[PDB]
Amino acid sequence: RTEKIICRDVARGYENVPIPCVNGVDGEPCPEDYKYISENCETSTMNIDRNITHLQHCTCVDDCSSSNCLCGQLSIRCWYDKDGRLLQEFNKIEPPLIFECNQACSCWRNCKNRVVQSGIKVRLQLYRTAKMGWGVRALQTIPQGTFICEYVGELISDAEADVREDDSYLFDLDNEVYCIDARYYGNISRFINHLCDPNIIPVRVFMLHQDLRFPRIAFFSSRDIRTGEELGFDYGDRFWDIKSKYFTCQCGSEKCKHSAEAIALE
Amino acid sequence: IRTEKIICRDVARGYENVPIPCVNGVDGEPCPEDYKYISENCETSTMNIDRNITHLQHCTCVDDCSSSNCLCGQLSIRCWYDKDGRLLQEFNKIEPPLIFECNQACSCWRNCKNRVVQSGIKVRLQLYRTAKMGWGVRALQTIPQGTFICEYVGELISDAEADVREDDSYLFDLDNKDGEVYCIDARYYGNISRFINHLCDPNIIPVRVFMLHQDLRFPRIAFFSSRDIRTGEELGFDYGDRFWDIKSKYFTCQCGSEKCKHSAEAIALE
Ligand SMILES: CCCC[C@H](NC(=O)c1[nH]c2c(c1C)C(=O)CC(C)(C)C2)c1nc2ccccc2[nH]1
Numbered sequence: 300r301t302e303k304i305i306c307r308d309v310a311r312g313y314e315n316v317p318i319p320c321v322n323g324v325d326g327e328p329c330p331e332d333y334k335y336i337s338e339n340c341e342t343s344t345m346n347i348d349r350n351i352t353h354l355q356h357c358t359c360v361d362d363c364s365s366s367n368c369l370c371g372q373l374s375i376r377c378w379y380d381k382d383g384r385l386l387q388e389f390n391k392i393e394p395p396l397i398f399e400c401n402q403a404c405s406c407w408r409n410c411k412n413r414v415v416q417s418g419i420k421v422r423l424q425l426y427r428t429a430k431m432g433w434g435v436r437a438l439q440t441i442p443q444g445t446f447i448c449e450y451v452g453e454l455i456s457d458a459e460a461d462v463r464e465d466d467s468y469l470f471d472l473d474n475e476v477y478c479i480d481a482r483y484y485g486n487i488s489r490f491i492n493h494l495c496d497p498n499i500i501p502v503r504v505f506m507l508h509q510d511l512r513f514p515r516i517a518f519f520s521s522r523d524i525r526t527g528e529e530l531g532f533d534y535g536d537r538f539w540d541i542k543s544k545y546f547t548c549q550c551g552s553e554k555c556k557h558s559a560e561a562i563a564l565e
Numbered sequence: 566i567r568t569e570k571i572i573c574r575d576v577a578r579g580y581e582n583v584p585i586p587c588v589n590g591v592d593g594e595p596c597p598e599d600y601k602y603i604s605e606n607c608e609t610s611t612m613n614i615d616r617n618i619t620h621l622q623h624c625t626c627v628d629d630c631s632s633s634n635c636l637c638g639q640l641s642i643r644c645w646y647d648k649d650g651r652l653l654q655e656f657n658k659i660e661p662p663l664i665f666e667c668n669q670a671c672s673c674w675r676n677c678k679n680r681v682v683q684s685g686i687k688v689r690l691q692l693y694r695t696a697k698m699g700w701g702v703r704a705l706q707t708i709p710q711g712t713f714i715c716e717y718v719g720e721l722i723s724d725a726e727a728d729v730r731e732d733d734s735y736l737f738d739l740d741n742k743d744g745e746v747y748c749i750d751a752r753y754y755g756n757i758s759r760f761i762n763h764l765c766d767p768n769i770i771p772v773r774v775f776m777l778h779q780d781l782r783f784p785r786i787a788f789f790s791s792r793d794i795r796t797g798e799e800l801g802f803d804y805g806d807r808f809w810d811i812k813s814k815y816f817t818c819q820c821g822s823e824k825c826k827h828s829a830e831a832i833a834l835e
């Protein structure tokens with residue numbers, strides 16, 4: 300069975316690079332039961348605080364590579380090396396909040412503290428997996444620490460999330476608590492699966508606003524990733540505690556945490 | 566015999582598609598820094614802009630949105646951009662129509678033909694010291710008629726706020742004929758447009774445009790060339806008789822055109 304290219308770019312040109320879709324596994328057509336968006340949307344009054352005088356910002360006259368950058372200090376330090384990658388000493392288990400530079404900073408748009416706001420740079424592909432439906436994999440080697448993509452979707456309150464009947468695309472910001480629901484509106488990140496041996500991590504980031512209701516979710520590689528490797532992050536125990544009553548994990552890792560065999564041993 | 570100095574390689578600090586340098590060959594005035602350059606409109610208090618994605622009108626096109634089926638074109642009466650991204654010749658240059666560009670709710674691609682203003686500055690511009698009008702903006706290249714130049718960017722404020730500030734040197738009135746009145750004030754936060762002088766023989770026109778939202782209270786202001794512009798020519802638009810009927814009480818127009826309407830030479834004729 301050939302691996303049919305079925306969409307040249309599921310992002311319709313909204314990302315820096317195309318995201319093709321292929322399926323060499325079954326007959327499932329290119330997913331179209333959602334609206335691809337590259338940035339978060341709202342479907343009720345959120346009124347994100349965008350008051351430019353409310354932004355904390357830096358006064359740097361360099362490239363914001365020094366430890367005196369206020370934006371870096373709000374992040375404990377700027378965690379981006381010279382190439383835009385997270386430092387090796389970055390805490391991949393309890394990631395800090397990242398405050399990037401913004402439109403109030405005196406620095407230039409290309410300073411060292413602007414990785415997530417500059418968008419996707421790696422070649423990704425939406426593909427049909429063997430056991431998990433659609434997935435996302437790398438079309439290039441990706442060094443550890445590289446920004447992959449943002450979890451983009453519909454901004455909704457925790458109360459609205461509690462009413463909705465499909466939480467398969469719901470990312471809880473864990474702040475009043477708000478969520479990103481990618482069920483109806485989403486980007487490439489809604490197709491990234493759970494892996495008990497993840498290779499990307501979510502990190503909360505502020506960029507062009509600092510409304511603490513709405514951190515933005517940035518995925519970075521937690522290790523070097525080989526070409527063709529599926530991308531995945533740890534959906535978390537709360538997800539699998541709820542979803543256990545319906546299905547079990549198919550990641551096939553020797554340290555799988557939620558497989559039938561694994562849960563049966565409990 | 567003063568030589569021209571380059572005093573900033575990009576007043577936009579890299580926020581635009583292209584750098585916008587500033588030069589002075591006229592006096593000792595340094596690069597203006599009494600404002601904050603921003604590439605997009607800002608808020609200093611809650612405007613409650615309607616950004617509900619389900620309120621967007623959008624098209625269902627699969628092509629490059631060049632057909633008459635495109636709803637976004639229809640909302641503008643038609644799509645007024647030609648294949649090159651220029652406003653059509655028959656486009657009304659007096660009371661122009663609202664332009665509704667395609668948006669994130671449309672099914673078309675980000676590169677369709679109805680996305681000129683949201684794609685940003687493409688022509689090469691220069692901030693320079695004029696002889697009689699302070700700073701101005703001039704073209705570094707030929708600019709054919711109909712080309713998008715830049716957006717009037719600044720701080721969104723209410724009518725009542727504008728009336729408190731009593732300073733319209735950098736104030737653009739959106740002139741919403743229906744309901745709530747808002748202004749763009751580029752005094753404190755602005756982009757290259759704040760530096761565009763008034764000309765009695767103008768070569769650009771402002772056009773109200775909607776892009777990522779369709780809150781009719783907050784059209785965005787897009788400047789397009791109203792004629793072919795030659796390299797070196799200062800850009801300017803007609804500030805409007807209302808501006809001068811207020812300001813001529815204080816100073817006269819220095820555009821120096823034979824068709825000047827606000828000169829001292831012409832102020833004694835009527
Ligand atoms: C589909 C999306 C992946 C599953 C999704 N993850 C998250 O919400 C989530 N929030 C957070 C993290 C993570 C994985 C972190 O790592 C840290 C944090 C960003 C601070 C907060 C999820 N978990 C759920 C639990 C119950 C009901 C629905 C659920 N959806």
Ligand SMILES: CCCC[C@H](NC(=O)c1[nH]c2c(c1C)C(=O)CC(C)(C)C2)c1nc2ccccc2[nH]1
Nearest residue numbers: 733734735736737738739740771803804805807808
């Ligand atoms: C300094 C900024 C350029 C002067 C500025 N122009 C405008 O507001 C303005 N609005 C409009 C157009 C124009 C020039 C149009 O061509 C048509 C339109 C876009 C529908 C509405 C101005 N004029 C004023 C008159 C009185 C008090 C303050 C003022 N500010």
Ligand SMILES: Nc1ncnc2c1ncn2[C@@H]1O[C@H](C[C@@H](N)CC[C@H](N)C(=O)O)[C@@H](O)[C@H]1O
Nearest residue numbers: 431432433467468489490491492493548549550
């Ligand atoms: N490790 C996993 N084991 C089994 N199913 C998974 C796993 N990870 C993701 N899934 C499936 O994918 C859903 C989560 C989605 N966000 C991921 C995209 C999904 N695979 C799709 O094709 O749309 C889950 O509700 C599961 O149906």
Ligand SMILES: Nc1ncnc2c1ncn2[C@@H]1O[C@H](C[C@@H](N)CC[C@H](N)C(=O)O)[C@@H](O)[C@H]1O
Nearest residue numbers: 698699700734735759760761762763818819820
């Ligand atoms: N036609 C004109 N004649 C004389 N002064 C003008 C003319 N057009 C603009 N100006 C001056 O520039 C102001 C408008 C500004 N938005 C333009 C930039 C301004 N020249 C500056 O140097 O900052 C006016 O209040 C005047 O001070």
Ligand SMILES: [Zn+2]
Nearest residue numbers: 357359363368
């Ligand atoms: Zn800095």
Ligand SMILES: [Zn+2]
Nearest residue numbers: 357370400404
């Ligand atoms: Zn900063």
Ligand SMILES: [Zn+2]
Nearest residue numbers: 363400406410
């Ligand atoms: Zn910076």
Ligand SMILES: [Zn+2]
Nearest residue numbers: 495548550555
């Ligand atoms: Zn597993």
Ligand SMILES: [Zn+2]
Nearest residue numbers: 624626630635
């Ligand atoms: Zn269309």
Ligand SMILES: [Zn+2]
Nearest residue numbers: 624637667671
């Ligand atoms: Zn459209």
Ligand SMILES: [Zn+2]
Nearest residue numbers: 630667673677
């Ligand atoms: Zn379109």
Ligand SMILES: [Zn+2]
Nearest residue numbers: 765818820825
């Ligand atoms: Zn004049």
